[PDB]
């Protein structure tokens, strides 16, 4: 009878500006019309799970929910629990979860020259050198409209070598080689709690890449007041 | 095809990171940043103050203008300073027109 | 203040890779570089990806440091491939300066 609770993640609320809430208590036998509660210790109302089958065909399922709380409740930092009862264990099971900063460091890198030289595909990575706390979310943009989930993959944070308190991660998008060859700009919009606007957008393109030629004219004229 | 990154008018700069396709084969296309600067060669140190020294040095740190010691008068902006005038012993202040061409009442 | 180098590994079906960094020909300390787990590639699930982030002082990177990378993995003909980057690893970047004095 595995018992677990999924705390709300601020990463989620930046993507949709909404909070989806459902506790997770797995490996329990069949129960008809499962109804489970969610009450932080100072007395929030009771809510049952939604969009979860009360009895899956496999008979090893998880039917337990969380009350829909607003973002301000987690900004407060109050405690939270899903209390679950079923035929297997008449005694209720309770678990407690709660949230225990520096400006995130979000600068990406472009593809290598040899990647484009291979003329097969290209790799663009939204590296983040450091952030605090660990929670962070990355989403990729194209022409101002969200990109399909399948293209980009986001890696979990890791502790910085010289700053173990600081945490770093990365995300990858496997884009086509010829698509990057043309001038199509991308933005790897990330989502971090410790931000002024709560979201950071940074973009690149071939125009932003390594330049070769610099024909600075640097004209010198006695015509001084007027520009150009 | 030019992307005008910066068009700062004080420190006249026209950085254009135009992409140039290389020959007939892509995948080695060259990117070039054309920092076209027009040093005035005659504007005063404090450009709004005509009585200031002459600019014998022009710093063009491109980092700052990408994101002030103004050098060249902007076309739209008017740079001017008060001047003393004496007609019959009366010292009356009045605004001047260091760039009269672009300072007509509009 | 610092320099970040990422070693991109792309296309190892066996899903087993062990990256190291040999700066000036000698391996560097393990804690300096941290690698990502081999999750599947987006384009092809059979393929996988991993990185390696080596944080180093900006000045050192600004003074002729190779910062070599290695990849231990079976399908390679010699089972190992090496890559490195420095200031001049990129294209020549010839200038085209002009100075008009009209
Ligand atoms: C010298 O440069 C400074 C700025 O670096 C300027 O001084 C002030 O400019 C404002 C702009 O309208 C005026 O309102 C002030 O009266 C100026 N200061 C003083 C003390 O008058 C200006 O560009 C130059 N100063 C002068 C006196 O021309
Ligand atoms: C830059 O080089 C090109 C040749 O690649 C040449 O045509 C052009 O005049 C040069 N720019 C100058 C001289 O400002
Ligand atoms: C810089 O080089 C390009 C060639 O790609 C040329 O078209 C342009 O005119 C040059 N700049 C100037 C100021 O002539
Ligand atoms: C200068 O720019 C490039 C680099 O040397 C060269 O190809 C071009 O022909 C030169 N042109 C002039 C006018 O110097």
Numbering used by the authors:
A (entry chain L): 345 to 444, 449 to 576
B (entry chain J): 3 to 69, 98 to 136
C (entry chain K): 468 to 569
Study authors write:
The predominant form of IgM is an asymmetrical pentamer, with five IgM monomers joined together by the joining chain (J-chain). In this work, we present the cryo-electron microscopy (cryo-EM) structures of VAR2CSA, TM284VAR1, DBLMSP, and DBLMSP2 complexed with human IgM core. In all these structures, Fcμ–J exhibits a pentameric architecture, with the J-chain conferring asymmetry on the central Fcμ platform, as seen in the complex with the secretory component (SC), i.e., the ectodomain of the polymeric immunoglobulin receptor (pIgR). The pIgR/SC-binding face of Fcμ–J is also targeted by the P. falciparum proteins, and the interactions between the P. falciparum proteins and Fcμ–J exclusively involve the Fcμ-Cμ4 domains, which is consistent with previous analyses.
For example, VAR2CSA, a major culprit in placental malaria, can bind to chondroitin sulfate A (CSA) glycosaminoglycans, resulting in the sequestration of iRBCs within the placenta. The 300 kDa ectodomain of VAR2CSA consists of six DBL domains plus the interdomain regions (IDs). Compared to the VAR2CSA structure determined in the absence of IgM, a large swing of the DBL5ε–DBL6ε arm can be observed. The IgM-binding sites in VAR2CSA have previously been variously mapped to DBL2X, DBL5ε, and DBL6ε27,28; however, our structure unambiguously reveals that DBL3X and DBL5ε conjointly mediate binding to the Fcμ platform. DBL3X and DBL5ε are located distal to the CSA-binding site; therefore VAR2CSA should be able to bind to IgM and CSA simultaneously. DBL3X and DBL5ε together interact with three Fcμ units within the Fcμ pentamer. DBL5ε, on the other hand, interacts with Fcμ1B and Fcμ2B, also mainly using a loop in SD1. Arg2059 interacts with Glu525Fcμ2B and Asn529Fcμ2B. A VAR2CSA heptamutant (VAR2CSA-M), K1238A/D1279A/Y1282A/R2050A/P2055G/N2057A/R2059A, failed to interact with Fcμ–J, validating the functional relevance of the molecular interactions described above. In contrast, preincubation of this IgM with the ectodomain of VAR2CSA greatly reduced its ability to activate complement-dependent cytotoxicity, with a half maximal inhibitory concentration (IC50) of 1.9 nM.
